[PDB]
Amino acid sequence: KLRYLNILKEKLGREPTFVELQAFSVMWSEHCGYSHTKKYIRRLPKTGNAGVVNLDDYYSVAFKIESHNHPSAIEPYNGAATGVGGIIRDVLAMGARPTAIFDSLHMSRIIDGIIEGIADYGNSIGVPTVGGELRISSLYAHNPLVNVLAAGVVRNDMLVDSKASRPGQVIVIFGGATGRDGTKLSIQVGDPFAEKMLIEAFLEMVEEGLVEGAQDLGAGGVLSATSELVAKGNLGAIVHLDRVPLREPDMEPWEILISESQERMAVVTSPQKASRILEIARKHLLFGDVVAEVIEEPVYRVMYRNDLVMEVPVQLLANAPEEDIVEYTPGKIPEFKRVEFEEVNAREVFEQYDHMVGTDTVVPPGFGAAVMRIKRDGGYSLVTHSRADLALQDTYWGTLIAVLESVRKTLSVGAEPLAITNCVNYGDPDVDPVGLSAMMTALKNACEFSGVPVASGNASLYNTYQGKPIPPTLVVGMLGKVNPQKVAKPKPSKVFAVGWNDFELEREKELWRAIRKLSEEGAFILSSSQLLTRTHVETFREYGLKIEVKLPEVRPAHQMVLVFSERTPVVDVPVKEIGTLSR
Amino acid sequence: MPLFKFAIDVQYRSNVRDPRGETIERVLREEKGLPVKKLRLGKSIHLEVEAENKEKAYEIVKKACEELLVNPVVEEYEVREL
Amino acid sequence: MPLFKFAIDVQYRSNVRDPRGETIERVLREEKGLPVKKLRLGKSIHLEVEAENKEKAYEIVKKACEELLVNPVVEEYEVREL
Amino acid sequence: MKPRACVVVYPGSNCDRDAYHALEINGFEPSYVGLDDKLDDYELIILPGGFSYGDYLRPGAVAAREKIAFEIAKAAERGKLIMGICNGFQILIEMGLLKGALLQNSSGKFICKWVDLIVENNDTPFTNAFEKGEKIRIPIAHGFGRYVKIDDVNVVLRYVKDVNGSDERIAGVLNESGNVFGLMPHPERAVEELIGGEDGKKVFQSILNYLK
Numbered sequence: 001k002l003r004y005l006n007i008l009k010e011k012l013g014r015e016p017t018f019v020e021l022q023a024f025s026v027m028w029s030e031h032c033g034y035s036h037t038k039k040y041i042r043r044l045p046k047t048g049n050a051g052v053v054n055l056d057d058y059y060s061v062a063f064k065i066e067s068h069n070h071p072s073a074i075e076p077y078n079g080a081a082t083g084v085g086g087i088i089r090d091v092l093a094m095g096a097r098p099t100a101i102f103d104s105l106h107m108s109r110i111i112d113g114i115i116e117g118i119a120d121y122g123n124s125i126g127v128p129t130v131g132g133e134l135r136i137s138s139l140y141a142h143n144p145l146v147n148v149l150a151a152g153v154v155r156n157d158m159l160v161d162s163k164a165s166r167p168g169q170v171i172v173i174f175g176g177a178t179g180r181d182g183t184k185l186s187i188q189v190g191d192p193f194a195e196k197m198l199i200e201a202f203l204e205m206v207e208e209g210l211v212e213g214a215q216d217l218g219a220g221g222v223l224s225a226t227s228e229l230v231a232k233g234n235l236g237a238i239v240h241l242d243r244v245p246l247r248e249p250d251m252e253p254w255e256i257l258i259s260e261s262q263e264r265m266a267v268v269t270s271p272q273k274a275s276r277i278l279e280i281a282r283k284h285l286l287f288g289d290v291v292a293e294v295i296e297e298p299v300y301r302v303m304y305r306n307d308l309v310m311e312v313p314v315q316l317l318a319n320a321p322e323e324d325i326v327e328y329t330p331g332k333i334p335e336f337k338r339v340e341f342e343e344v345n346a347r348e349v350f351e352q353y354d355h356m357v358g359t360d361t362v363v364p365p366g367f368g369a370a371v372m373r374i375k376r377d378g379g380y381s382l383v384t385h386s387r388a389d390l391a392l393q394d395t396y397w398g399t400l401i402a403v404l405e406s407v408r409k410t411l412s413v414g415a416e417p418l419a420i421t422n423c424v425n426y427g428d429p430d431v432d433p434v435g436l437s438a439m440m441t442a443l444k445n446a447c448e449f450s451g452v453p454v455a456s457g458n459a460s461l462y463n464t465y466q467g468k469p470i471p472p473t474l475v476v477g478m479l480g481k482v483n484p485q486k487v488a489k490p491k492p493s494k495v496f497a498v499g500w501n502d503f504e505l506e507r508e509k510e511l512w513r514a515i516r517k518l519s520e521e522g523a524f525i526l527s528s529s530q531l532l533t534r535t536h537v538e539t540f541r542e543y544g545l546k547i548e549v550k551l552p553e554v555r556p557a558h559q560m561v562l563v564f565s566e567r568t569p570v571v572d573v574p575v576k577e578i579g580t581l582s583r
Numbered sequence: 584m585p586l587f588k589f590a591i592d593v594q595y596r597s598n599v600r601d602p603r604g605e606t607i608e609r610v611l612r613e614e615k616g617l618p619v620k621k622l623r624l625g626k627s628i629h630l631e632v633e634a635e636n637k638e639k640a641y642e643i644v645k646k647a648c649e650e651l652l653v654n655p656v657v658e659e660y661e662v663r664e665l
Numbered sequence: 666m667p668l669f670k671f672a673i674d675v676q677y678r679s680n681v682r683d684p685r686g687e688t689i690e691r692v693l694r695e696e697k698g699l700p701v702k703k704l705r706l707g708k709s710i711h712l713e714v715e716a717e718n719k720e721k722a723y724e725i726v727k728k729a730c731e732e733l734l735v736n737p738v739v740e741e742y743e744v745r746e747l
Numbered sequence: 748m749k750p751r752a753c754v755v756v757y758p759g760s761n762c763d764r765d766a767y768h769a770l771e772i773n774g775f776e777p778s779y780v781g782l783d784d785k786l787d788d789y790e791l792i793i794l795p796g797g798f799s800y801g802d803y804l805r806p807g808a809v810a811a812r813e814k815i816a817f818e819i820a821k822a823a824e825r826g827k828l829i830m831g832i833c834n835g836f837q838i839l840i841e842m843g844l845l846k847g848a849l850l851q852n853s854s855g856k857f858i859c860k861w862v863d864l865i866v867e868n869n870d871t872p873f874t875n876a877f878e879k880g881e882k883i884r885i886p887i888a889h890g891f892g893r894y895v896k897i898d899d900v901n902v903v904l905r906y907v908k909d910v911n912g913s914d915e916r917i918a919g920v921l922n923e924s925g926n927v928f929g930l931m932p933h934p935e936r937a938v939e940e941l942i943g944g945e946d947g948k949k950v951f952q953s954i955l956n957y958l959k
């Protein structure tokens with residue numbers, strides 16, 4: 001809103017009021033506006049709901065990843081904690097029970113603050129933290145990244161929309177109290193207890209069949225929730241702010257609208273089914289009332305009882321000014337030198353997280369990918385990967401190998417890929433709109449090569465200190481279909497290094513179809529950047545196993561995995577015997 | 584030589600809402616029915632210092648706060664002698 | 666309807682081990698290097714109360730401590746006014 | 748035609764869906780019981796894990812001073828078997844049906860691992876399907892699992908090593924009579940070999956063996 005002001009004045013035909021100036025300074029920001037990414041995001045192949053993937057025609061898994069790097073910069077604990085909160089709700093809005101969370105951390109040292117953040121929150125809501133990243137390097141020192149990925153399971157005959165379908169409907173706001181939360185007006189503590197009461201409250205409203213549409217209240221709050229609920233429906237809404245559950249009754253109308261208070265949710269239902277929805281909230285210790293009315297005219301009316309404060313067209317809010325793309329075309333696969341990333345033990349970080357709650361975790365973290373189940377059905381496998389060390393030398397091939405090496409880790413357990421979830425953590429997009437394109441086109445092409453679509457995404461730009469940008473890191477989140485019985489559990493066997501030391505895309509699909517011919521055969525595969533990490537040897541010791549091998553030194557960009565079978569692997573790719581895994 | 588007993592009373596700042604203390608405030612007034620308006624729940628750290636004067640002792644406690652015990656962003660504090 | 670500000674200092678018994686506190690003593694002597702021996706860690710609860718007089722107000726605080734706030738097994742408390 | 752069991756859903760409990768499931772596949776007929784409910788009709792009362800009332804002042808203390816305490820105590824004196832797991836143990840020590848207290852782990856924060864235990868006592872309605880000293884693999888998830896002995900209590904389960912720094916490596920204790928069980932390791936997780944082990948479905952087979 002430093003230059004986008006002049007573009008707003010010509011669409012309104014006058015000067016904006018104090019209510020409108022604060023509304024569009026948050027709605028047309030780079031967080032919930034997407035000005036430098038909206039046009040690239042349409043070019044990427046998607047999967048009529050954005051965030052859900054069909055698994056068994058009976059069930060469907062809902063997953064998304066958000067980036068809370070900015071509130072984690074000022075305060076680590078209450079930042080990462082706040083992060084798990086806003087992503088858990090974006091999954092619950094689809095009517096799914098949050099079944100798995102991931103934490104993609106990128107710091108200078110294992111900051112006890114960010115770690116304890118995801119812990120005290122994730123464990124308090126009974127959602128297992130079944131894995132995550134821990135890329136430690138002094139390049140992130142003054143700019144840490146925290147990408148939390150929440151996942152949930154849901155029946156297809158109980159799925160919830162994310163838009164208001166017809167007029168004559170009402171939007172109900174419930175959850176925690178709505179106060180003054182938006183080094184002063186930006187720091188807030190999360191209430192993981194209210195979040196659990198919000199989950200069990202919402203999921204009873206779903207089974208009661210009273211949810212016809214819903215949206216989370218994270219960034220922007222009541223404004224960015226009720227406006228985006230009628231913007232994807234092409235309809236409108238009349239918002240009464242006197243009906244919003246206030247904590248401090250002495251709040252001015254604009255503060256009730258722009259309030260970015262947590263633990264709140266938005267539900268679209270009919271006025272006859274609202275008397276039963278508020279009784280479910282009061283039963284779960286939550287506060288709620290009817291705030292908005294869905295009309296036919298595509299306008300957004302905001303008033304406070306009888307007097308008005310703001311009225312602007314609905315589509316002028318959800319659609320931010322789309323910047324122009326600078327299409328990038330691919331260059332030669334460079335010779336990558338090894339960028340030293342401190343090799344740490346992930347056990348010390350996840351043994352602080354409840355990764356077994358729900359009793360649905362089949363494969364606990366340590367050996368990359370994590371496999372889950374649905375207690376009856378079938379299961380799903382999620383992995384989180386980002387080749388940050390390669391992305392530094394090449395903004396394209398580094399980011400492309402990240403999407404491919406992700407699919408490599410998903411086939412290692414025995415799961416056939418279904419979807420991807422992106423998260424762009426670029427530096428300044430105006431000083432270098434060239435590097436952002438090399439990344440977005442690296443994710444577009446890598447999704448056409450593997451034929452794996454993108455369900456949902458995110459982008460947190462402007463990450464700089466001293467003016468110097470952050471290493472372009474794209475975090476991929478895979479999802480795959482698997483049978484919880486046909487999973488690789490570490491047995492005492494001989495270790496084989498399969499694949500080749502060098503990288504060449506021209507024969508990458510030959511490694512994938514080589515891993516597949518080895519998984520349904522009953523072997524344990526391990527795909528990692530450094531082949532075997534400190535983490536792998538420590539998770540092996542917990543299974544009472546010791547590993548002694550001669551790891552063939554590979555180049556940073558490689559196509560190799562370690563296979564632990566009984567007899568010599570029968571595949572059409574280099575198979576060398578490197579050791580054993582006794583006792 | 585010499586001893587100096589202290590007690591730190593940490594708390595979340597005035598503007599920051601503490602749900603921990605607000606859930607207990609709501610319990611003591613509705614479930615236990617005791618007329619109690621407006622609780623805060625923080626940390627109280629007792630520590631013995633070995634310094635020189637009374638002046639040198641107080642500034643020791645102050646460095647241990649700004650560097651570890653009291654988070655300068657959301658926490659506020661006030662120390663008293665023992 | 667008068668208000669009486671109180672502050673309850675809760676601590677673990679002087680012989681009950683608090684390694685959460687021995688870990689804090691480790692750091693800010695070896696990592697922050699200050700001469701500070703002998704450090705215990707506990708809770709600090711502030712609560713305002715409505716009653717007739719001050720002697721009947723202190724009775725409410727003393728009740729809340731026995732049956733919620735303080736664990737009589739390993740915690741000791743001392744209340745003061747504000 | 749099968750025995751009656753119940754799992755108490757306290758506002759904030761996370762391991763209720765795990766208790767129900769662990770009870771269903773082990774010969775019982777579970778039923779979720781909330782607050783203001785009566786526990787007369789049940790033969791086994793399970794006090795579930797998780798974070799009851801978000802552990803806001805102290806673990807399950809805000810749940811111990813709840814209405815169904817007057818109903819658990821009534822069932823305790825009557826002699827009906829009560830088993831409180833991870834968070835439930837913390838509730839029973841604050842209710843006073845169990846001796847001692849549970850404080851924060853010596854190793855500062857949360858522990859979620861597959862811990863090795865030795866059953867120091869069978870001839871207990873919850874551990875008679877085990878030998879005297881069987882080495883069993885059953886998981887945990889603590890941030891407050893440090894047991895502190897206050898009275899010569901009846902030791903049932905002991906860790907092999909040193910996890911929380913709990914006095915005499917205590918994982919599980921019993922009542923005076925022997926109907927109320929306090930447990931730190933989660934047994935509702937060691938029922939299927941998919942999640943990890945089966946050493947814990949014998950804790951349930953032991954309850955069916957008491958009810959002849």
Ligand SMILES: Nc1ncnc2c1ncn2[C@@H]1O[C@H](COP(=O)(O)OP(=O)(O)O)[C@@H](O)[C@H]1O
Nearest residue numbers: 131132133134346350365366367368528533535
């Ligand atoms: N911060 C973390 N939180 C939870 N799990 C983690 C964390 N860091 C790493 N892990 C888990 O450890 C394993 C990854 O180990 P790592 O050394 O990164 O090898 P890889 O390159 O295969 O991920 C996966 O299970 C990953 O989810």
Ligand code: NA
Nearest residue numbers: 090216218219
């Ligand atoms: Na959202």
